[model samples]
Target: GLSDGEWQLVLNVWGKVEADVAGHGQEVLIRLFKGHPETLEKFDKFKHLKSEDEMKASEDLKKHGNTTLTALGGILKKKGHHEAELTPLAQSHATKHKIPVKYLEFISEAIIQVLQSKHPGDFGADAQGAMSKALELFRNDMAAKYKELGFQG
Candidate 1:
């Protein structure tokens, strides 16, 4: 649960990244792959790109990365009433793709890291907590997805 003030902080910081949404999303995924290389095994498009530079140059990464940012931007636009838009990712990632949905949880640090790198002089904690809270809410909304996903086991 985030405060009204926290959402403002979220948007304020997110607003800064909005200018380069594609690059922002690309960095987040790159950091995710670096932190947990094993996660890359899930994506047919990612396994060959063993390093950040390759991923940075990837067409798949750029396409999906920008799409990721676009989806997030959609949610931010809807603000407090966004489930209609987000339910698709829950279904797509957990069911259709069958990727370990838990991997989404791992990106919080990448997000904070991106925030830090994007604005070095801003200082954090407040932004970190705000991002953490947003991640928590996202987790809650998607918690049922694992069960809901119809896996072919």
Candidate 2:
């Protein structure tokens, strides 16, 4: 759904942010859980955290954020040919974690918001637009996997 130039823009913006995937990814999860507090229970690692301050100070949360963003960065950097990488994870998210696929939308929005605030100079409309499309495609593919597994969010 993205043109060559658009995809390149996604990569260019991602490149600037990739160096601090840990911090940026942590912010993304923080935003998601803050907006949708119920979603925090879905993460076993941090489900014990009962308040905003606890969540904000959690190393486990930050580590999981790093893990997630690293996986996404791997997929995007490969020029969208990482279905092999995406499918298994989607299945696990569907089955093992029992996470609703809908949360991916929250995560995507969190990512976009985090990037815009964290890198104001780099994340202009063009980059945001490209990222929106990129995340949409990625989310669609994950939804497809969920559908294949008969998991309806």
Candidate 3:
């Protein structure tokens, strides 16, 4: 749970970025793939994309990117109570997709970095710290759900 001040900061910064959710969200995924190439293979939709240009041209990438931001946005707007929204998604990722919960950190890092790249002034140290804490809390909840769904290693 975030303190009052941190919550406010996170919402404020998120508000600034939410206006370009799709575009920025795509950038976050791009950053993730660029930094962790193995992650690309996990996404069947765009796994064949061998270059950044090819990825950028993917409609599937855009749709999934929109999903990423939409999920996070909905969770944040609800003030981090994400069980109803995130739990099933986490479970599916574990049982159906077999995606490791730990990979969430890479996505979260990509999100934070994208925010910094897009709005450096708005996402300074204080805002970054707030978002990091918020993301960490959400990711932890997802990990718990994954464990409950019988995901191992």
Candidate 4:
């Protein structure tokens, strides 16, 4: 089994990202490849999979990508790419404490908000303003979460 330190690294990284996003910190909201090592090894055995198998593999990858993206979206919300300084902070903490990134519900919410907003051209200035407001809401949410977690920034 992996060390507790390794598990903690995963959790901290995950928590940081979740705080950045609007996620609820639920594990089911995240995607993890339980058999990734085995899958890769199997893939290596075949020069190429049969067409049907290839399609199945592609589908699996797509599902995983969707799940991962949902989690990532939450991360982007709280930490905004620009303010992701904490990523390194999280990584350092992981190195020192053995936590690993795990949760990402917040990212999913942030992404949903952005995606739901109609384009400025389509929804007019009011709609655009609403989108901006939603983003501000996410920012405020992240700020509060960080404070609760004792994050200075």
Candidate 5:
């Protein structure tokens, strides 16, 4: 779904930010929860953390943050090539968590914000479009698979 231009532009920034692991990962998730406080309700361990400071210090959020970046890194690396490997997770989020796709979309916003913020002069409009295409493709695939996975809602 991504243009070759997008694929090329995105890999540079995506890997750079993703390379930070814990630090970058925490930032993205933290931004996500901050932007939509209700999303935290889906995360039992995080829901009570309440504030960004609390969440940052919480051990569980650290673990969750690392795991999140790790998973997302893997998926982004694959880019639309391996849906079967990731769709089960799509199922879990959709069916078990009953998490709306929009919440997942929220993380994409964080991806852009943190990447641009991480490299003040580096990230640009092209990079933004590139990541948008990649995330859009990934999100749509997840949506399709989530429905196929017998979504309870």
Candidate 6:
């Protein structure tokens, strides 16, 4: 289970998803902990977006993509777990949108690079390893990124 602060972080991220989508942004706020009740609740709220209509709606709000991507980058930077925190989100985005694994990897890598460049020495070694693992897991259909990280997929 996540601590209260973690839960709040997750909530903040998930809560922003709709706005992000409506704005056609790429960085949907995401909770890192999937098993938490609060996280589950948020997931339930937007789970319908997995359907075609919601997907189209998201496309209609194209500007939200940039908002989402920017928000995601900010969260990862603040959390200090860029690789560990983002890989699952990347994989989820790919799976939900039916995008290729390579594209997912590209996004993950790009985000990590952004974090590294932004934070410089603050990003931990484990974070780098985790990000690499995430890229490897989603690359070429290896497995879910969370599962590779030993978390629920």
- Clash counts per candidate, in order, are 0, 0, 0, 23, 0, 15
- Predicted candidate 1 versus true structure: per-residue lDDT over 1-153, tens digit per residue: 578888877787788778888888888888888998877777787889968889999988877777877787677655456778778887887766666646767766677778888876652778777767886677666665456655422
Compared with the true structure, what per-residue lDDT tens digits does model 2 show for residues 1-153?
689988899999998768898888788889998988888888878888887788789998888889989999988876677789898789888999988878989889998999898888888889999999999999998998898889888
lDDT (Cα, 0-100) at 146 in candidate 5: 72
Error of 6 at 69 (Å): 4.9
Give me the runs in candidate 6 sitting further than 4 Å from their true place. Answer: 1-96, 134-153
Each prediction's Cα RMSD? Answer: 2.4, 1.2, 1.2, 15.2, 1.7, 12.8
lDDT by residue (42-150, candidate 4, tens digit) is: 2243324343345345544445445544544444344334245444444433344332222122333433333333122343444334434444543455454455555
After best superposition, candidate 3 residue 133: deviation in angstroms? 0.4
- My TM-score estimates for the predictions, one after another, are 0.87, 0.95, 0.94, 0.28, 0.91, 0.33
Best by lDDT: 2
Q: What is the per-residue lDDT of model 5 for residues 1-153, given as tens digits with 9 covering 90 to 100?
A: 787777878777777866678888888888888888888899877778868899788877877778887887788777678686678778778777887778768888887788878875668888888888888887788777877776523
Which is the winner by lDDT between candidate 3 and candidate 5? 3
Better of 1 and 5 by TM-score: 5
The better-scoring model by lDDT among 1 and 6 is 1
lDDT of each: 0.75, 0.87, 0.85, 0.37, 0.79, 0.43
Better model by lDDT: candidate 2 vs candidate 3: 2
Return the clash pairs for model 3, or none.
none
Looking at candidate 2, the ten consecutive residues that score lowest on lDDT are 74-83
RMSD of 4: 15.2
Compared with the true structure, what per-residue lDDT tens digits does model 6 show for residues 1-153? Answer: 334454344444334333544332322222111222232233343554543345445543245446546555454343334555555565565455444344444456654554455445544565455545434543433235534644332
